[PDB]
């Protein structure tokens, strides 16, 4: 844009939280589907749902990990990784049922003299293999 808007420079705001980035590579919407609330025609439990809205739909930052030459990779599961995150976690443990979409923002800056490439994958039903 001639007003300066860039594919690389984004701002995301959810609830009381804002993320800025100046070196993005656009952003992905998985399978082209934006998150949505459950529609009446697809509904199943009949009780009134709770929708905590801004109290749970906000950015939670997890513990920072460290990338080195010996790193083989990292994994997390959702909603598990957020089970202890504020009122989202509370709502999760108080109810039998729950559904949620997510904005995932992975952060890793370095310098024009560093190099490396992280593949960041969101996998539906990411069943992992056991040690046995």
């Amino acid at each position: 844009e001639a007003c300066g808007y860039s594919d690389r420079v984004l701002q995301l705001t959810l609830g009381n939280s804002t993320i800025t980035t100046q070196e993005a590579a656009n952003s992905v919407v998985a399978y082209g589907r934006w998150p949505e609330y459950l529609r009446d025609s697809e509904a199943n439990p009949v009780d009134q749902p709770t929708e905590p809205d801004v109290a749970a739909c906000r950015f939670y930052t997890l513990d920072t990990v460290s990338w080195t030459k010996e790193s083989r990779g990292w994994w997390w599961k959702l909603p598990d990784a957020l089970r202890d995150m504020g009122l989202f976690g509370q709502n999760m443990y108080y109810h039998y049922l729950g559904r949620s979409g997510y904005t995932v923002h992975v952060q890793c800056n370095a310098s024009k003299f560093h190099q490396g490439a992280l593949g960041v994958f969101a996998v539906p039903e990411m069943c992992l293999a056991g040690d046995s």
């Binding site: 009446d40 025609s41 509904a43 199943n44 009949v46 009780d47 009134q48 749902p49």
Partner: protein, 50 residues
């Protein structure tokens, strides 16, 4: 029997119900062959005591 539905005693949401009772119609409940007997016959020579 008290004809209640969930919205009578709790807060409910709107749900568009798609389920049906098609398989529990009297016809559907009985629409199966069931074994009622086993008959035994043979093809042996008839002889004076059998």
């Amino acid at each position: 029997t008290n004809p209640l539905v969930p919205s009578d005693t709790v807060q409910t949401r709107h749900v568009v119900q798609h389920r049906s009772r098609s398989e529990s119609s009297i016809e559907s409940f009985f629409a199966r062959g069931a074994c009622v007997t086993i008959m035994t016959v043979d093809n042996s020579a008839s002889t004076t005591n059998k």
